[PDB]
Structure 1
Amino acid sequence: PFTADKGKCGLPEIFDPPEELERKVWELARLVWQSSSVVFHTGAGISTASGIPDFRGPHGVWTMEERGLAPKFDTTFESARPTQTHMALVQLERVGLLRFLVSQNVDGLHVRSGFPRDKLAELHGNMFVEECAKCKTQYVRDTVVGTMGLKATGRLCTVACRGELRDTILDWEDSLPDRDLALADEASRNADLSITLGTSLQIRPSGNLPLATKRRGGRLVIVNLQPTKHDRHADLRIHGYVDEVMTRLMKHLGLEIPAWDGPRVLERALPPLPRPPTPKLE
């Protein structure tokens, strides 16, 4: 835990020049249009623009620790608002363009943004989510569940149970949740396009899931300011702010980025909304 391998921290940022950025985002549009099954992989870099530092960016939690420095939060978990990237993922799921979302983030922002839980895998757990040790019933709170490392919170299951409620925050030794991992892996294996957003892909097996898309000839796209573990394997690497990449992509897709109505929890994906017609490519 003290000894835990925190991988490579504080690598240089890469900034694609704007004409190269414009080009690459058009190409991402073309891949989205060509794909039958698109899966998104998120990590801590999609929340930095909400005030939440990452792990391994220049001001990452682990990076700043390596140097004797403290990470800075510009918000609480509760006051954090989903980013333009978070809201674009909501929209792309609603128009049938996103088959599944896989997140290593515990920041709770995908759920609070209103993203259907039956189309999300929270690999590392969710700070607002406790789970009944007895009946496995999960509870999505309006505040952070106060424990980490799957400890009893002090609340009991109210299901028609009295089970001890625990946090969902994985510790270093903790195996990932079988349910989330299995659906993530299946979605990743069966996808024809895997897009990674603000993750350095250094965690096994979370950071490996995008490579599964590569077998049977799926395409892998990586959006990240820093190098990532699998950059070699990517058909397209875009070095820019995800908010800028996602905003430009949505405009190419003819989609608006919807308003956030404050923290909401959708259990189950709604019926798919209309989407603009597809460009002729060739």
Structure 2
Amino acid sequence: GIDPFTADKGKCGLPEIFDPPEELERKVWELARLVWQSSSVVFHTGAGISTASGIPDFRGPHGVWTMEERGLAPKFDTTFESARPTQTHMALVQLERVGLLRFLVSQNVDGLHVRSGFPRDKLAELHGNMFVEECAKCKTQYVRDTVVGTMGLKATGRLCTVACRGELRDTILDWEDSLPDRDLALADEASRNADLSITLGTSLQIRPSGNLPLATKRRGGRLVIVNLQPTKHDRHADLRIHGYVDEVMTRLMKHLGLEIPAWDGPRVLERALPPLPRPPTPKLE
């Protein structure tokens, strides 16, 4: 249940850029330097961090919209339910736990940030979550083990169980639907206050999601864009890294002296913990 018409789907199928190995290694060291220098690092994720799980993106060579425009179908190598979080998903978990990530803003509805164990009080799911239904009455969210089987904020069939019997609805925005105010305000506040915003596997074409990383540049914030394709705001990036995000984040975590933790299977953390110990910072200047 995903539209093909009145939706303007932006620029789809643009060519991939691969930074050569020596330029990729230098840029990821510079990204390391930037994380180390930064008080407040906000990460922005889109469908490119889930491609290495089997979930096709929207506008890449084999993206959903790209393939529809040529009369082909996207291909899933997994169900949403059987999808494992990527090395990128798990790198972001560890960065939050060691206190190097202040906030995570995601356009992804694939539910993997949440199932990765990422604290929900540091995550904005701007476009909703396949696995999350919300009570129309009391706004209580339920994180389910299977995808909520509707889209576009419709009644799911189930009712609220809060000590309510309220109508349960999906959280998946249709084209016409506004972003959730709570998530967008927190994403917006995190982004304005950030001194570093790193975008991972998003083409930044969708307002207001794809403009949030620009809000960081106000007050002299740094923007880094990791993406295989061009992005709407490449021009405003202090650093563009054209590589597989799993390679970039695996080399970055190596430079930061951080391990990428194991995924235990689907777990839900509501609230972030005080940060875990982290390695001491290199002398930079």
**TM-score bracket relative to the smaller structure:** over 0.9
Q: What is the SS of the residue equivalent to 2:65?
A: helix
C-alpha distance in 1, partners of 2:38/2:53? Answer: 30
Where does the alignment leave 5 or more consecutive residues of structure 1 unmatched? none
Partner Cα separation in structure 2 for residue 36 and residue 181 of structure 1: 22
CA distance in 2, matches of 1:258, 1:107: 20
Partner residue, 1:104: 107
Give, in whole Å, the separation in 1 of the partners of 2:176 and 2:102: 30
Alpha-carbon shift at residue 117 of structure 1 (Å)? 0.2
CA offsets 1:222-274 (integer angstroms, 9 cap, x no match): 00000000000000000000000000000000000000000000000012100
Can you list the C-alpha shifts for 1:51-88, whole angstroms capped at 9, x where unaligned? Answer: 00000000000000000000000000000000000000
TM-score by length of 2: 0.99
In structure 2, the partner of 1:118 is 121
Quote how far apart the aligned CAs of 1:219 are.
0.2
Q: Deviations over 1:15-69 (max 9, x none)?
A: 0000000000000000000000000000000000000000000000000000000
Deviation at 1:174, TM superposition (A): 0.1
CA deviation profile, 1:133-186 (whole Å, cap 9, x unmatched):
010000000000000000000000000110000000000000000000000000
Alpha-carbon separation, structure 1, partners of 2:190 and 2:222:
14
SS class of match (1:209): helix
- 1:227 is matched with which residue? 230
Aligned pairs for 1:60-139 (under 5 A) are 60-139=63-142
CA distance in 1, matches of 2:208, 2:259: 33
The number of residue pairs the alignment matches comes to 282
Distance 1:52 1:24 in 2: 27
Give 3-state SS (helix, strand or coil) of 1:130's partner. strand
Match of 1:172 among 163, 175, 179: 175
Q: Distance in 1 between matches of 2:131 and 2:58?
A: 20
| Inter-partner Cα distance in structure 2 for 1:273 and 1:3 | 47
Residue matched to 2:10: 7
- Matched position secondary structure for 1:9: coil
Structure 1 residues 43-54: aligned runs within 5 Å: 43-54=46-57
State the distance in 1 between where 2:135 and 2:5 align: 29
Give, in angstroms, the shift of residue 3 of structure 1.
Answer: 1.7
CA distance, structure 2, for counterparts of residue 272 and residue 45 of structure 1: 27
- Structure 1 stretches of 4+ with a deviation exceeding 3 A read none
Following the alignment from structure 2 to structure 1, what is the Cα–Cα distance between the partners of residues 175 and 132? 19
Q: Secondary structure at the match of 1:214?
A: coil
Q: 1:13 and 1:194 mapped to 2: Cα distance?
A: 22
Q: C-alpha distance in 2, partners of 1:272/1:3?
A: 45
Report sequence identity in percent: 100
- Point out where structure 2 has 5 or more consecutive residues left out of the alignment: none
Cα offset for 1:2?
Answer: 2.0
- Give the distance between the partners of 1:70 and 1:156, measured in 2 at CA: 35
Q: Distance between the aligned counterparts of 1:190 and 1:87, measured in 2? A: 24
Separation in structure 1 between the aligned mates of residue 110 and residue 273 of structure 2, nearest angstrom: 23
Which runs of structure 2 are paired with 1:1-282 in the superposition (5 Å)? 2-282=5-285
Distance 1:37 1:270 in 2: 17
Partners of 1:78 and 1:3 in 2: CA distance: 30
Distance in structure 2 (CA, Å) of the matches to 1:9 and 1:226 = 10
* 3-state DSSP of counterpart to 2:240: strand
